[PDB]
Write a protein that binds this ligand. Structure first.
Ligand SMILES: COc1ccc(CCN(C)CCC[C@@](C#N)(c2ccc(OC)c(OC)c2)C(C)C)cc1OC
Ligand SMILES: N[C@@H](CCC(=O)N[C@@H](CS)C(=O)NCC(=O)O)C(=O)O
Length: 1333
């Protein structure tokens, strides 16, 4: 080895000894160090054995022949040089290890082989080097090498094909090349462009990713760790997911080391360029090396991502699964400790935090390592001056720190300021009819605007924080570079800033940019994950229930002796010393007062109570009808079935026996209707009916009916007891325990267990208990792509001047950056007078001025983008609110309130917060790519020949990502929420799930939900890997071509130009894929603006204020109403209505269900436009008057008064127009003075959502107080305990005003003269009640 023939000549030939020693030791050596390690994977991971195929044999036979050929050399050598003995034998032995390895890989089920691929690639390269040397030298031993090389090449080609297997995910059967390049998703991508992606096209999860495989291992590990007893969830997580984290650590270390090869090869290239008389091949070598290294880096890095992402995926699944399982075992006290919302948060935000932390968790050690290595390299280049740059990095430690903290604070406040608003919006939509009737649209618009501006103040304050953060991501490279260069050129004048010591350092600064700024974000995520992990450990350490506590003996039916139960370990017993024996097929009624311990008995028989002592021996399956009915959001049929085979005869015998036939009839789809909170709401009695029907269908032997007939009416209850619970019903032979407080069915009960204060008190049969005359007698005596129009709409909303100013400013940003780097290039070309440069001070001052301009410009650009973001959020929210409030009630009843809450919450969150960040990051990446291309073209114009093809590839890749990822990011969004919804419903009915022993069914359903979510999410991140590989293969191609065209034109190119072009090419690699990632996020985000602007063109109400034909101040002079041929369209509910209600004449409206009674009120307030009618009050037409005017001059007391959150005064007078004396007088006149004076807050009593704290009677009287305070001559009443009071009050002082009354009760209407009867919209009778009879 000497430089004359290897380095300093125009023919870069390796020496003969080097060829025969190191080039052969490299590949053989690779297999020798990997072989042992590879048994670990081959053994721990198995998939069966592959069959006997031609490919596998072809590879094995060539391995045998290759070994022979290599040993044939030893034979000829045996037939002087020491290397002619050891090298052939070593090659033969490693070759014998290669063929044995494909053999064992066949045995262990490895279709492709990465180890048997990289090894052949390394051998091929070594053979290629020797080959070129041997063909340049020119029979005896050469022909053996040609045979060796041809066999190695054919072996390498064979090793690429994937063997036979021993919508499945293609990753399982993908080859090594397809796995590293992520080609197995490519087809999906093109599919995602050709046709829309549904959940049916998503591949089945890998077996190792399915919930039923990951959750168990975590469950067993956690049980083992908690059995060893303080529990540590971190150790459990480590023990479960260690291999993935270690693999990610290895890949991140490799990437860390390989990303700094770029600057070293750039330094070598700059030395090559500035030094002429150097062999040209050295140049083309360096570029090639750089490209190769870069390629390797990206591959490694993306593998490092995949594992991490996969790991996070698995972790999320495990956590969710574990939580679900823990939800089914925890005692009642433990669930009372943490609210249902907090457990759902454990499922959602903690798991999401873990999965999104796993992406950058490894930077907690990579970033310090990257920083230390980069500082070492800079110290090699610059010297001690690098310390100054370190100072800037140190100066970036606190700022980022406080920045992070401040952001969190703002975010938290933002969250709060949003939640209230959403709650208020939830009150506006649920109660919009009342607001329209009372014309309170403007008041609640003002309230929502106030809360929104409170949120916008926090958003504006966080705009500055985000601008500071953007600055620390754009000027961190220059902030370090300017300091280091200034110190370097100032401390000693002999320090020359050549291209090697400037642009290599600049590339190092660009590298240092990421780790420095991501370390604070990683720390913040680690703290936010520490709190979530503490919550997860708190939940998973909660006490477990003992099914053993209750003896569940398969088929004296229920046995309890001396059993005392508790609701908590330290709380006193609720059931003291209970004993009773319920025989098989007997009806037992629990009897007591409120708080006696009746429901506690049924809870204790289900192992829900904490048994401090006793013995319970419930025999056979138990069907529980809880007091609070638990309804699944599935259809009513599946609610009754409860995951059981449908039997048409048994189902149709159960449904009517519960008297569910009328309920089925009223419901739209029958029994297929979607009952539950999300679907159609059901009355309490109907919910009890569904619960009882589910229990009866379940066909258990023991039934625990905790007050099944509380909410059903007396006739319905008696019918139910006759056909279901009674001795002649459906459950005649079933052991039925019924908790009741109704005597009507007591004599039919076989055994009555009457108790008092949680103690058995003389149980017995009804007649015997009555004869005894004791406790029971006492008890009885008790009583496509988004269009550019939406982008332009956001541009208009963001502020046209703001948008164009931001574009111009950030153009100045990138122009300043490019000019600063070109100025540095000119500075590096400066001649050196003696040991000093010509003009260093001037160039340094210009560099600093350009950089300070760039810093203030990025500050201003981020500031302006965020300011425009808050501007657009304000305008879009205001327009959405105005459109929603001005829209008719028909729109509200048509569109589900879920979509309106979606608009007001998630679209607003996307528009106001993350759209501006997406815009900033996308613009930055796009112009970084543009500037890199501009610099490459300026340095090497010929490189334009690479612009089309690569660009074409980019375009193609972009398309195949943008069309596909969105579809995968939509299917994720629709699949994540069901997982928590299911959990929430499970959390609500844990007792029902336990009682019916259907825990495994719900566990499997949760597994399926999480599996669907992961089937949506895994392609989402694999698509990111695929796009990143594709585009960092283009940016690597950009690096190679810029480097190659700089080497080709090295004579006309200065070293500074080469360094500048190569550094910008290095950074465009990272910037290019993020450009497309951001573009996809922008496309997904602008659909939010589209959704916000949807109701802007829908049909709106008539104008609230006309102001051309406004009525006088006293519009209802006497209150003379005249329906002149009124016809309401919603074929005609109201038709042929010609009636006249005189001023101050009491008139009521009577009719059956389906008549136009209520619709008539909607005619008065113009809720629905008159299809044909001329309602005129006094001498003024209603249709001509603006809505607000008439809605203010007419008052309505609806069926259910809607009390809004806030003070009572804001309920009575939202506008605060009426004085306090008027409010007090109206409240006194509403029989409410005594109560309203009782609240400590006086008139400012904070009533909750819907007035839950207030009683129904009080809310009704508050609505009456509203009507009385309005002091209008026309009043409408909608009648359904306090009836005597409200009727008297409406008959007390409103005799002066004209009152219409729609009452379902004839008793009240009889008092009112001039009754109007509506049969089917027609006026059946028009006259006084005296003429009625
Ligand atoms: C590409 O230019 C920019 C990059 C980042 C920023 C700051 C935006 N901040 C929210 C920080 C983003 C941080 C981050 C993300 N997401 C990021 C995005 C894009 C990046 O450049 C390709 C990046 O590397 C510098 C980091 C990390 C966490 C992956 C502004 C930029 O320009 C205005
Ligand atoms: N050179 C950086 C690259 C890290 C990187 O790619 N950053 C962002 C994108 S520029 C990322 O992690 N991407 C996550 C994703 O795939 O969504 C390093 O030090 O790892």
């Amino acid at each position: 080895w000497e430089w004359n023939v290897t380095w300093n000549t125009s023919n870069p030939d390796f020496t003969k000894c080097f060829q025969n020693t190191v080039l052969v030791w490299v590949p053989c050596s690779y297999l020798w160090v990997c072989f042992p390690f590879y048994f670990l994977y081959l053994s721990h991971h198995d998939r069966g054995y592959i069959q006997m195929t031609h490919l596998n044999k072809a590879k094995t036979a060539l391995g045998f022949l290759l070994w022979i050929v290599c040993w044939a050399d030893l034979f000829y050598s045996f037939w002087l040089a020491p290397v002619f003995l050891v090298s052939p034998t070593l090659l033969g032995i490693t070759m014998l290890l290669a063929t044995f390895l494909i053999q064992i890989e066949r045995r262990r089920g490895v279709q492709s082989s990465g180890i048997m691929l990289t090894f052949w690639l390394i051998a091929l390269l070594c053979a290629l080097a020797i080959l070129r040397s041997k063909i340049m030298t020119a029979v005896f031993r050469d022909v053996t090498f040609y045979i060796y090389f041809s066999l190695v090449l054919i072996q390498l080609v064979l090793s690429c094909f994937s063997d036979r297997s021993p919508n499945p995910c293609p990753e399982s059967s993908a080859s090594f090349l397809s796995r590293i390049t992520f080609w197995w998703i490519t087809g999906m991508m093109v599919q995602g462009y050709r046709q829309p992606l549904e959940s049916t096209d998503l591949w089945s999860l890998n077996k190792e990713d399915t919930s039923e495989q990951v959750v168990p291992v975590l469950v067993k590990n956690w049980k083992k760790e908690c059995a060893k007893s303080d529990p540590s969830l971190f150790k459990v997580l480590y023990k479960t997911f260690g291999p993935y984290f270690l693999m990610s650590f290895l890949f991140k270390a490799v990437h860390d080391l390989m990303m700094f090869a770029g600057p070293e090869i750039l330094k070598l290239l700059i030395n090559f360029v500035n030094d002429k008389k150097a062999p040209e091949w050295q140049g083309y070598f360096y570029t090639a090396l750089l490209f190769i290294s870069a390629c390797l880096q990206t591959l490694v890095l993306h593998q490092y991502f995949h594992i991490c992402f996969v790991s996070g995926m698995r972790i999320k699944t495990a956590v969710i699964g574990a939580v679900y399982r823990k939800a089914l075992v925890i005692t009642n006290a433990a669930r009372k400790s943490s609210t249902v919302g907090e457990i759902v948060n454990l499922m959602s935000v903690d798991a999401q935090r873990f999965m999104d932390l796993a992406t950058y968790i490894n930077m907690i050690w990579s970033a310090p390592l990257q920083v230390i290595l980069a500082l070492y390299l800079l110290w090699l280049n610059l010297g001690p001056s690098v310390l100054a740059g370190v100072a800037v990095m140190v100066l970036m430690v606190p700022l980022n720190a406080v920045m992070a903290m401040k952001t969190k604070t703002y975010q938290v406040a933002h969250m709060k300021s949003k939640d209230n608003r959403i709650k208020l919006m939830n009150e506006i939509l649920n109660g919009i009819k009342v607001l329209k009737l009372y014309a309170w649209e403007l008041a609640f618009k003002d309230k929502v605007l106030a809360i929104r501006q409170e949120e916008l103040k926090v958003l504006k304050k966080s705009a500055y924080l985000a601008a500071v953060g953007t600055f620390t991501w754009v000027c961190t490279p220059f902030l370090v570079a300017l300091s280091t260069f200034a110190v370097y050129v100032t401390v000693d004048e002999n320090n020359i800033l050549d291209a090697q010591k400037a642009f290599v350092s600049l590339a190092l600064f660009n590298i240092l940019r990421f780790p420095l700024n991501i370390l604070p974000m990683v720390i913040s995520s680690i703290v936010q994950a520490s709190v979530s992990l503490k919550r997860l450990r708190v939940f998973l350490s909660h006490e477990d229930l003992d099914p053993d506590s209750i003896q569940r003996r398969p088929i004296n039916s229920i046995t309890v002796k001396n059993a005392t139960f508790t609701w908590a370990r330290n709380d006193p017993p609720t059931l003291h010393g209970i004993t009773f024996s319920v025989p098989e097929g007997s009806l037992v009624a629990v009897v007591g007062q409120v708080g006696c311990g009746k429901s506690s008995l049924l809870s204790a028989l289900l192992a829900e109570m904490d048994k401090v002592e006793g013995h319970v021996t419930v025999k056979g399956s138990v069907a529980y009808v809880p007091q609070q009915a638990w309804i699944q959001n599935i259809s009513l049929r599946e609610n009754i079935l409860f995951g059981r085979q449908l039997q048409e005869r048994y189902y149709k015998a159960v449904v009517e026996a519960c008297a569910l036939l009328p309920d089925l009839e009223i419901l739209p789809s029958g029994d297929r209707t979607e009952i539950g909170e999300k679907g159609v709401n059901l009355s309490g009695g109907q919910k009890q009916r569904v619960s009882l029907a589910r229990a009866v269908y379940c066909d258990s032997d023991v039934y625990l009916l905790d007050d099944p007939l509380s909410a059903v009416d007396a006739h319905v209850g008696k019918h139910i007891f006759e056909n279901v619970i009674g001795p002649k019903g459906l459950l005649k032979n079933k052991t039925r325990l019924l908790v009741t407080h109704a005597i009507s069915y007591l004599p039919q009960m076989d055994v009555i267990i009457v108790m008092s204060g949680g103690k058995i008190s003389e149980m017995g049969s009804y007649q015997e208990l009555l004869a005894r005359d004791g406790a029971f007698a006492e008890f009885l005596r008790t009583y496509g792509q988004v269009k550019l129009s939406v982008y332009w709409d956001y541009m208009k909303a963001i502020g046209l001047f703001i948008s164009f100013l931001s574009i111009f400013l950030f153009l100045c940003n990138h122009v300043a950056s490019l000019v600063s780097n070109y100025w540095l290039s000119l500075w590096t070309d400066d001649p050196i007078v003696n040991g000093t440069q010509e003009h260093t001070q001037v160039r340094l001052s210009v560099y600093g001025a350009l950089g300070i301009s760039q810093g203030i410009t990025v500050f201003g650009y981020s500031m302006a983008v965020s300011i425009g973001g808050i501007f657009a959020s304000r305008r879009l929210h205001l327009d959405l609110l105005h459109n929603v409030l001005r829209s008719p009630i028909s729109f509200f009843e048509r569109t589900p309130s879920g979509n309106l809450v979606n608009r007001f919450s998630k679209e607003l969150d996307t528009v106001d917060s993350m759209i501006p960040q997406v815009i900033k990051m996308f613009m930055g990446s796009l112009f970084n790519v543009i500037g890199a291309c501009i610099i490459i073209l300026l340095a090497t114009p010929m490189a334009a020949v690479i612009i089309p093809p690569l660009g074409l590839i980019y375009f193609f890749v972009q398309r195949f990502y943008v069309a596909s990822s969105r579809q995968l990011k939509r299917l994720e969004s629709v699949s994540r929420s069901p997982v928590y919804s299911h959990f929430n419903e499970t959390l609500l009915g844990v007792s029902v799930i336990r009682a019916f022993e259907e825990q495994e069914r719900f566990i499997r359903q949760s597994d399926l939900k999480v599996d669907e979510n992961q089937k949506a999410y895994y392609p989402s991140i694999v698509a990111n890997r695929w796009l990143a590989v594709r585009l960092e293969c283009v940016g690597n191609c950009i690096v190679l071509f810029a480097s190659l065209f700089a080497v080709i034109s090295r004579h006309s190119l200065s070293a500074g130009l080469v360094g500048l072009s190569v550094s910008y090419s290095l950074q465009v690699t990272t910037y290019l894929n993020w450009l497309v990632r951001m573009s996809s996020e922008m496309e997904t985000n602008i659909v939010a603006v589209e959704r916000l602007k949807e109701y802007s063109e829908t049909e709106k109400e008539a104008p609230w204020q006309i102001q051309d034909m406004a009525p006088p101040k006293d519009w209802p002079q006497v209150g003379r109403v005249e329906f002149r041929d009124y016809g309401l369209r919603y074929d005609l509910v109201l038709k042929h209505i010609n009636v006249t209600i005189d001023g101050g004449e009491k008139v009521g409206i009577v009719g059956r269900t389906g008549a136009g009674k209520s619709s008539l009120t909607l005619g008065l307030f113009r809720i629905k436009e008159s299809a044909e009618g001329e309602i005129i009050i006094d001498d003024i037409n209603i249709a001509k008057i603006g809505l607000h005017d008439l809605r203010f001059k007419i008052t309505i007391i609806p069926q259910d008064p809607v009390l809004f959150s806030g003070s009572l005064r804001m309920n009575l007078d939202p506008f605060s127009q009426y004085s306090d004396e008027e409010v007090w007088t109206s409240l006194e006149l509403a029989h409410l003075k005594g109560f309203v004076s009782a609240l400590p807050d006086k008139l400012n009593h904070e009533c909750a959502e819907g007035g839950e704290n207030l009683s129904v009677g009080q809310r009704q009287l508050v609505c009456l107080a509203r009507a009385l305070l309005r002091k209008t001559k026309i009043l409408v009443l909608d009648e359904a305990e306090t009836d005597d009071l409200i009727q008297s009050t409406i008959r007390t002082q409103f005799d002066d005003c004209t009152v219409l009354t729609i009452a379902h009760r004839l008793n009240t209407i009889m008092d009112y003269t001039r009754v109007i009867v509506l049969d089917k919209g027609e006026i059946q009778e028009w006259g006084s009640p005296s003429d009625l009879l």
